[PDB]
Assembly symmetry: C2
Homo-oligomer: 349 residues x 2
RNA sequence: CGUGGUUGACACGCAGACCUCUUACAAGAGUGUCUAGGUGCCUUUGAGAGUUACUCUUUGCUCUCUUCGGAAGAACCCUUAGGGGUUCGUGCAUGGGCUUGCAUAGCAAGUCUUAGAAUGCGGGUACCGUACAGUGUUGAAAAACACUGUAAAUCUCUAAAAGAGACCA
């Protein structure tokens, strides 16, 4: 079990109640992890590669991971104009990308679930729980959780934008979840779920594994936004476009803080290949391999590793990791049609 | 149609867009009526008998009436502690109550429908509507739709309590109703729904048929309260119970305003019996029969009809109205069991 | 913006931008490309009636003549030629004196300029260069002529928002 809490804790930067997670790993042989995915259009890299890495870490630890294709969450946030069929197409696109990028679906440990079909099948189990969470939480607590949706508390929130935390908190218990492996922004609704467990006196509270929020490619972008395609790497971005964005990616010399390129390295590459090789001419210090992020940041700050070397090796490696998905969507006809339809849709706020 | 227009109009104290109502009666041979009521315990007279009078008078106009069994909604309001089983038992109690009191169901024009059952059978049709109502209306408007559960906007609100108004407003297009026969009390959510569709630019708003809110037997009670059985005559109340409640009922001499006995006559006896007979000794002016309410008020204000004579006649007529219910619940085993269980349930605020 | 070409084509002095390559946004290379807007007016404007649980208001969708003349320009019907019957096209806030809150002059307000087209702004209305899709011609490439359109391609093809009068979990 020791390696296991290491393997899983490596999934998220923030882990609440580490001892209880250890207990769960020790006692219940196949913990169930989940994350929610609103199909809101083209999905950027932090969504694909980092999550594939995380789910692979979990399944290698023996965890069952449920990928919640949260369609009504997408409509509740008026994605795609709230269109059922476009949203279904986008979800199929996402599943295809995950299969292509190297997600261990064939392992039999990853199950992709639709909120509409699944919840439609057990409405009686769910809706009472939503009513209960909604009843046991005043409005203000629900509104504070709006950041799960990407909306501030000052946003004019539709009453559905008020219910949304209720359903998303409920899914935690609907799905009988053990580990909430999600992003930072899901932290408020996850705490809503624990305080609900406190209200309903369920001893077994869910473990919380909140993941690092991958920044946008431009300076000061705490997170990639689908609204700025140049600031977000899309998993279907082409070789040249990878290159262009990266070149345009912010990467000040000797400055690690707020330097996105180093962060994407840290959270994608070293997790992907265990090391980062910067290929350099003999005159400029020759080829160099970074097996760890500390070595990379040291060589970056000292000035031995300049951004002009990081970014090219960086985009090289990014295009490498992305090439299999390019090949899949070039080869698979249904995936190709899904890609064309998804790019044919307008991104909505 | 003018006959139909008058008949339907007489049901409610306030009838709105009378032009639209006349148009509907002329163009739709069988317009759709309904009532939504939380099964929250013992049935008092204003809720049973007045509703029976209105629904029967409407069905004689050829109208179809859908009685909305508000079990899921009642659970939203925590009736019987929100226990759906007790809610269902109370609903069966109330249905057999209407049957005993003289509903025209055998005419095939009255329909009892279950909110939980129908919503589950057509949840795909329902839930989107509630969402939409949530969207097009801010929080403040839905809280302004608070009353249809009862409290003012100031009392503490949970999120389920915010589902409720939009859920009723969705009931509208869920039921395909053209005229909504309910009390004055459904009003601000009524325009919640008109605003809803003005926004969708549909073409035909349904009519309201607002029933008078019957006061309690005590001074200053603008409406009946089940929290006060002493101010509430229950349709299963024995002759002694009715007589005592009427005796303690507020009825100042020569004062018509706020005299619940007079409104009780107006809305139960004259509508039910077409007349009101006050039995008095030859010395006390002898028996007098009131066919119209104005004659009753003229004699009452002039002092010829004293409360000592009005109250016994009121109690006699009310007991006459309630005797069929007593006989039904005395003879029918299932009705008697339902009565036992409903009386056994603590009316939960 | 100018140049030689009288002129269309053809090249040059400056900017910008679309695409590629590099490159840390920056920055640098490539002529593959393009780059004037006008001629014309209207458009601040009675009321009511309707937009799937009340009224009304701030706004939006439909029915009667569509307020200083209101269908501006267009289109449909009929003509000796002058004309006529019909439809569509319905923009939004302020002033300026009038007096005050202010010793008169910000901002607003009680009044009018049906609208001082005055101050700010879009849409439709023919023509033109431009560019392309389509026709016919001159045309060996290129270029050009005339018509439809676009230049702000296109629209809630109906998921129009808010506000004031009430009985809860």
């Amino acid at each position: 079990p020791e390696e296991k809490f290491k393997i899983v804790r490596s999934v998220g930067e923030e882990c609440i109640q580490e001892d209880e997670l250890l207990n769960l790993l020790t006692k219940k042989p196949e913990p169930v992890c989940y994350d929610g995915f609103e199909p809101s259009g083209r999905m950027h890299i932090a969504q694909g590669v980092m999550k594939t890495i995380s789910v692979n870490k979990l399944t290698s630890a023996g965890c069952r991971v449920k990928i919640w294709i949260a369609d009504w969450f997408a409509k509740l946030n008026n994605k795609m104009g709230g269109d059922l069929k476009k949203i279904e197409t986008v979800g199929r696109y996402l599943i295809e990308i995950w299969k292509a990028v190297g997600m261990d679906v064939e392992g039999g440990k990853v199950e992709f679930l639709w909120s509409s079909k699944e919840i439609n099948a057990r409405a009686d189990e769910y809706w009472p729980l939503v009513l209960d969470i909604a009843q046991k939480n005043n409005l203000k607590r629900i509104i504070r959780c709006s950041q799960i949706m990407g909306r501030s508390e000052q946003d004019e929130l539709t009453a559905a934008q008020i219910f949304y935390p209720c359903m998303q908190c409920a899914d935690i218990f609907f799905l009988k979840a053990d580990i909430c492996q999600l992003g930072m922004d899901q932290r408020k609704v996850n705490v809503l779920a624990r305080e609900y467990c406190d209200d309903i006196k369920r001893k077994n509270k869910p473990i919380i594994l909140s993941h690092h929020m991958l920044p946008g490619l431009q300076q000061g972008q705490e997170k990639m936004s689908k609204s700025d395609p140049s600031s977000s790497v899309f998993m279907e971005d082409e070789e040249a476009e990878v290159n262009v964005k990266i070149k345009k990616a912010y990467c000040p010399p000797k400055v690690v803080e707020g330097n996105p390129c180093l962060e994407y390295i840290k959270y994608l590459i070293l997790p992907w290949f265990n090391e980062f090789t910067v290929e350099r001419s003999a005159d400029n210090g020759g080829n160099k391999t970074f097996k760890s992020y500390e070595e990379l940041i040291a060589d970056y700050e000292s000035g031995e590793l300049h951004p002009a070397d990081l970014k090219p090796a960086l985009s090289k490696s990014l295009n490498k990791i992305l090439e299999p998905v390019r090949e899949h969507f070039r080869k698979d006809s249904n995936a190709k049609e899904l890609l064309k339809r998804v790019k044919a849709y307008r991104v909505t706020k």
